[PDB]
Amino acid sequence: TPHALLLISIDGLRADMLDRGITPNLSHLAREGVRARWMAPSYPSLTFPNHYTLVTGLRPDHHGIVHNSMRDPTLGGFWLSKSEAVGDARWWGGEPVWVGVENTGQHAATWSWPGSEAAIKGVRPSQWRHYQKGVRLDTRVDAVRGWLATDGAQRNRLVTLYFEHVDEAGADHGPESRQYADAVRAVDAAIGRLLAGMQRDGTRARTNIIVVSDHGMAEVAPGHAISVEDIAPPQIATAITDGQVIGFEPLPGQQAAAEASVLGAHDHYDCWRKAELPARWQYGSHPRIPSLVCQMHEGWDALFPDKLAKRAQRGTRGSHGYDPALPSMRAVFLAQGPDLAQGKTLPGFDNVDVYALMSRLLGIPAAPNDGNPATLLPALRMP
Ligand SMILES: [Zn+2]
């Protein structure tokens, strides 16, 4: 029979965090279900590009959400809080799973998944919301609980759930901090209450569940921040993004200065013309990508000079956006329910492979994607 699918993201949950005895509910779920050793993000290892990859099966270079902050010659500027860029379907390539679900005449309900605020290929989820900071754990958990309990023609085949809490604590104090651990416990306990609730609604047993994160987290120790203008001064190029994936557009008639001073290897970063980026990143062909892309080494940030003055307090902090082959960047994948195996472990794999699993659990035809449809067949009860 057709079963519902609950898709949960715990933003910035690193893969080793399942094995520290701070996720009793997730650990139990994995033991009853399937667990990957880890799941690698796509390049760049950032929140928006990876949440969108997860639901499309496409690499960021194909789906168009190539950074958290971008420019396009036609659509203008995009960043996470410009709601009318985020809510504009023209940024978002491919076909996310909720579109596919709606196009079968079934219903999708999304708690704040990146892209779910837009009418992608003209199609919205049945239930959704604009992202709001500070929404309570038990608020979103009860909404999702209700969307899963919904009967009749309003029945949801797909429900998605997002938590920011782990990522926020990690950004502030680093991934080895007690604040990061507390946020993990808290999100884990929230999921426990969700599961218990589903047991009481009688929705648990007919619901498949996938829990993922978008990327992991690396520690950024005091003094590990430079200015983007140390990479290329404003005389020669414009920094389009800061953080860890630093995009530059040289000034007109400054190619040579830009390329002579920026390209290649430096103390704590490396830079490439976008077309010449490391092949395994599968990134650099999209026109929205700045002509020059620099990658900061793990544990280092390059910041706009105004931020650099503001922050420089002290305090261990945390960042993602590093090389997706780094252990620190590893995300989680686990799954459990009536159509998923039990007590199974899977090898490490790339996050573009989740899409094909979800298509099959949702009874939708899989759109074309960058994933390998074989990788997650073993997660199924019956391949
Ligand atoms: Zn994130």
Numbering used by the authors: 44 to 426
What text appears in the publication on this structure?
Since ENPP1 is part of the highly conserved nucleotide pyrophosphatase/phosphodiesterase (NPP) protein family, we investigated the evolutionary conservation of the analogous histidine residue and its requirement for cGAMP degradation. Two zinc ions are required for NPP’s catalytic activity, with Zn1 being particularly important for stabilizing the leaving group, whereas Zn2 activates the threonine nucleophile. We found that Xac NPP not only degrades cyclic dinucleotides but also prefers 2′-5′–linked over 3′-5′–linked cyclic dinucleotides. Furthermore, the conserved histidine is required for degrading the 2′-5′ but not 3′-5′ phosphodiester linkage.
Since the histidine (H362 in mouse ENPP1 and H214 in Xac NPP) is one of three residues that chelates Zn1, we hypothesized that the loss of the histidine prevents Zn1 binding. Indeed, in contrast to Xac NPPWT, which binds two zincs, our 2.0 Å crystal structure revealed that Xac NPPH214A was missing Zn1. We found that Xac NPPWT degrades ATP and that Xac NPPH214A (which corresponds to the mouse H362A mutation) degrades ATP several-fold faster than NPPWT, suggesting that H214 is not conserved for the purpose of scavenging base products from ATP. Indeed, Xac NPPWT degrades the metazoan 2′3′-cGAMP while the NPPH214A mutant does not, mirroring our findings with mouse ENPP1H362A. Interestingly, H214 is required to cleave cyclic dinucleotides with 2′-5′ linkages (2′3′-cGAMP, 3′2′-cGAMP, 2′3′-CDA, 2′3′-CDG), but is not required for cyclic dinucleotides with only 3′-5′ linkages (3′3′-cGAMP, 3′3-CDA, or 3′3-CDG). We also docked 3′3′-cGAMP and 2′3′-cGAMP into our H214A Xac NPP structure. Similar to ATP, the free 2′-OH group in 3′3′-cGAMP can also take the place of the missing histidine to chelate Zn1 while the free 3′-OH group in 2′3′-cGAMP is too far away from Zn1. We propose that ATP and 3′-5′–linked cyclic dinucleotides are able to compensate for the loss of histidine with their γ-phosphate oxygen and 2′-OH group, respectively, explaining why H362 in mouse ENPP1 and H214 in Xac NPP are only required for cleaving 2′-5′–linked phosphodiester bonds.
